[PDB]
Design a protein around this ligand. Structure first.
Ligand code: HEM
Length: 153
């Protein structure tokens, strides 16, 4: 798992996100959708977004970004003790949304990218290490739930 020092770094970085949850959420989803157009197809309600300008102008996309990052923030603040929070998310993503774990890898990478893009020179090597560990733990615990369900895609 993560050390206490690493968790402290994770939650310090997260303060940056909390100052502008909607803006961070929007940028994360736009990074995801533009880098990996197949991901947009999992969202019946975002399929109409044919350009990045349309994505940027979408208030509902910002809303979803807020929902996503709020859930992730709640999980991170549990510092790994997140079974109750994570299980239902894993299960809704496997059974209802059909989100392959690959897409969770994509969004994890997007979060790291957005942190650097919005805070260049202010997301240090130690902080990236810690946040990466936290996102890997999140993804890995979801992966265990996916395996339980036999879900691949
Ligand atoms: C940090 C990772 C993610 C978190 C914390 C997260 C969180 C959430 C939450 C809280 C909801 C609403 C409740 C629910 O349905 O369980 C949701 C809905 C949804 N998510 Fe995720 N999500 C993540 C990643 C992804 C990815 C990578 C995709 C697709 C590539 C995705 C696709 C969807 C879809 C299609 C819905 C339903 C949207 C709607 O039509 O209202 N999610 N997500």
């Amino acid at each position: 798992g993560l050390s206490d020092g690493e968790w402290q770094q994770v939650l310090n970085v997260w303060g940056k996100v909390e100052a502008d949850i909607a803006g961070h959420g929007q940028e994360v989803l736009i990074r995801l959708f533009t880098g990996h157009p197949e991901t947009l197809e999992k969202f019946d309600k975002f399929k109409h977004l044919k350009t990045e300008a349309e994505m940027k102008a979408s208030e509902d996309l910002k809303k979803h970004g807020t929902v996503v990052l709020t859930a992730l923030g709640g999980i991170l603040k549990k510092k790994g003790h997140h079974e109750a929070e994570l299980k239902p998310l894993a299960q809704s993503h496997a059974t209802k949304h059909k989100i392959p774990i690959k897409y969770l890898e994509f969004i994890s990478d997007a979060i790291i990218h957005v942190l650097h893009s919005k805070h260049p020179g202010d997301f240090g090597a130690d902080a990236q290490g810690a946040m990466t560990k936290a996102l890997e733990l999140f993804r890995n615990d979801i992966a265990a739930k996916y395996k339980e369900l036999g879900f691949q895609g």
